Design an enzyme around this catalytic site. Structure first.
Site, mmCIF file in Angstrom:
data_model
loop_
_atom_site.group_PDB
_atom_site.id
_atom_site.type_symbol
_atom_site.label_atom_id
_atom_site.label_comp_id
_atom_site.label_asym_id
_atom_site.label_seq_id
_atom_site.Cartn_x
_atom_site.Cartn_y
_atom_site.Cartn_z
ATOM 1 N N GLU A 104 0.836 -1.194 0.000
ATOM 2 C CA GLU A 104 0.000 0.000 0.000
ATOM 3 C C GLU A 104 0.870 1.243 0.000
ATOM 4 O OE1 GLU A 104 -3.369 -0.230 2.964
ATOM 5 O OE2 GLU A 104 -2.229 -2.005 3.573
ATOM 6 N N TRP A 168 -0.695 -8.468 5.700
ATOM 7 C CA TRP A 168 -1.749 -8.771 6.652
ATOM 8 C C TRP A 168 -2.286 -10.176 6.415
ATOM 9 C CZ3 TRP A 168 -2.057 -5.715 10.696
ATOM 10 C CH2 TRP A 168 -3.116 -5.865 11.597
ATOM 11 N N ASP A 170 -4.863 -13.584 6.346
ATOM 12 C CA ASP A 170 -6.209 -13.904 5.893
ATOM 13 C C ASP A 170 -7.164 -14.025 7.075
ATOM 14 O OD1 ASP A 170 -5.527 -14.197 3.094
ATOM 15 O OD2 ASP A 170 -4.628 -16.133 3.616
ATOM 16 N N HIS A 216 -1.666 3.581 13.426
ATOM 17 C CA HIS A 216 -2.447 3.900 12.235
ATOM 18 C C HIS A 216 -2.261 2.831 11.178
ATOM 19 C CE1 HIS A 216 0.821 5.277 9.510
ATOM 20 N NE2 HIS A 216 1.335 5.920 10.544
ATOM 21 N N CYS A 217 -3.282 2.686 10.345
ATOM 22 C CA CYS A 217 -3.200 1.946 9.090
ATOM 23 C C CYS A 217 -3.268 2.969 7.952
ATOM 24 C CB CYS A 217 -4.295 0.874 9.047
ATOM 25 S SG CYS A 217 -5.944 1.386 9.625
ATOM 26 N N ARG A 223 -7.886 -2.003 10.748
ATOM 27 C CA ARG A 223 -6.822 -2.678 11.481
ATOM 28 C C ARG A 223 -6.415 -1.906 12.728
ATOM 29 N NH1 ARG A 223 -3.510 -3.051 5.865
ATOM 30 N NH2 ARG A 223 -4.629 -4.810 4.897
ATOM 31 N N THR A 224 -6.520 -0.578 12.691
ATOM 32 C CA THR A 224 -6.129 0.223 13.847
ATOM 33 C C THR A 224 -7.043 -0.051 15.035
ATOM 34 O OG1 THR A 224 -5.088 1.988 12.561
ATOM 35 C CG2 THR A 224 -6.083 2.564 14.715
HETATM 36 O O1 VO4 Z 1 -6.134 1.314 6.244
HETATM 37 V V1 VO4 Z 1 -7.526 0.720 7.684
HETATM 38 O O2 VO4 Z 1 -8.668 0.045 6.007
HETATM 39 O O3 VO4 Z 1 -7.509 -1.271 8.145
HETATM 40 O O4 VO4 Z 1 -8.862 2.051 8.442
#
Ligand code: VO4
Length: 282
Positions: A104, A168, A170, A216-217, A223-224
């Site tokens: 990402e 991440w 599954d 943070h994600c 995920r956060t």
């Molecule tokens: O980049 V997060 O989609 O797990 O708010």
């Protein structure tokens, strides 16, 4: 029964109402507003609760779930990096957990600056990144760790441990197991760093607004929130805190999207089931 489909449906019903009503309206006084047109929210619909906002120019919130104190934020925009680094230093951040994947961050279409793996200058702040250990979290998932050293003329130099989850898992038992291992690693890393400050006599130890893990994600709600929920279940102080409580608390203190996907809530339900922790408030 307590973790059966009826209870889970009731939990989802309560949380859905909370989400729908926390949805931001234009110029919503509950949420931090952009200043003079400068982009504040990475995602238009994922906003920052004003009363718990950390800085007026970040999408970032103080969160307390039960007794557990953290900061949840979006991945900083390129324009926000100097402010984001100043937040990290002023907080004496004992751990920064980045849950956005390497792929990402690489995708320039997403505008996620690679701010913790490279050294740079951001306005008045200079940052050095040194890669430290690598910790497997299970199922092939790897946590790359770093020390970020934040320097700024006239300011105390601060080094921030970083836990970066590079991919991440599954859905399912693999993700619940990786989440548990991640919460342990993030808690441990923070405790080691907080202890260093305590041994130096840092005044930060007495300030409940400081020494908070920063998580943070990409948007800081999926995920956060899953990780924050997992961390609060590791806190011995949070006996009897329900899953309804912890998600309601994250939502009122950041936005209605915290725990964005059904699968993220299912991870929290499975961790709670493992502890005999209630899903619902009686
Ligand atoms: O980049 V997060 O989609 O797990 O708010």
């Amino acid at each position: 029964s307590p973790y059966g489909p009826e209870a889970r449906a009731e939990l989802s019903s309560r949380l859905t109402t909370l989400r729908n009503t926390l949805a931001p309206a234009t110029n919503d006084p509950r949420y931090l507003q952009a200043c003079g047109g400068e982009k504040l929210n990475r995602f238009r619909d994922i906003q920052c609760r004003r009363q718990t906002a950390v800085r007026a120019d970040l999408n970032a919130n103080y969160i307390q779930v039960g007794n557990t104190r953290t900061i949840a934020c979006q991945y900083p925009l390129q324009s926000q990096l100097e402010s984001h680094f100043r937040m990290l230093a002023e907080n004496r951040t004992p751990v920064l957990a980045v849950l956005a994947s390497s792929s990402e961050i690489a995708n320039q279409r997403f505008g996620m600056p690679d701010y913790f793996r490279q050294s740079g200058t951001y306005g008045s702040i200079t940052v050095e990144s040194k890669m430290t250990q690598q910790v497997g979290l299970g199922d092939g998932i790897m946590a790359d760790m770093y020390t970020l050293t934040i320097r700024e003329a006239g300011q105390k130099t601060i080094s921030v441990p970083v836990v970066h989850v590079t991919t991440w898992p599954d859905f399912g038992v693999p993700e619940s197991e990786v989440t548990k291992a991640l919460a342990s690693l993030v808690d441990q890393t923070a405790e080691t760093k907080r202890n260093m400050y305590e041994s130096k006599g840092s005044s930060a130890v007495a300030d409940d607004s400081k020494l908070r893990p920063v998580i943070h994600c990409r948007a800081g709600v999926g995920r956060t929130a899953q990780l924050i929920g997992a961390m609060c279940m590791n806190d011995s102080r949070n006996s009897q805190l329900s899953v309804e409580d912890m998600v309601s608390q994250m939502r009122v203190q950041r936005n209605g999207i915290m725990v964005q996907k059904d699968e993220q809530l299912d991870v929290l339900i499975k961790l709670a089931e493992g502890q005999g922790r209630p899903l619902l408030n009686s």
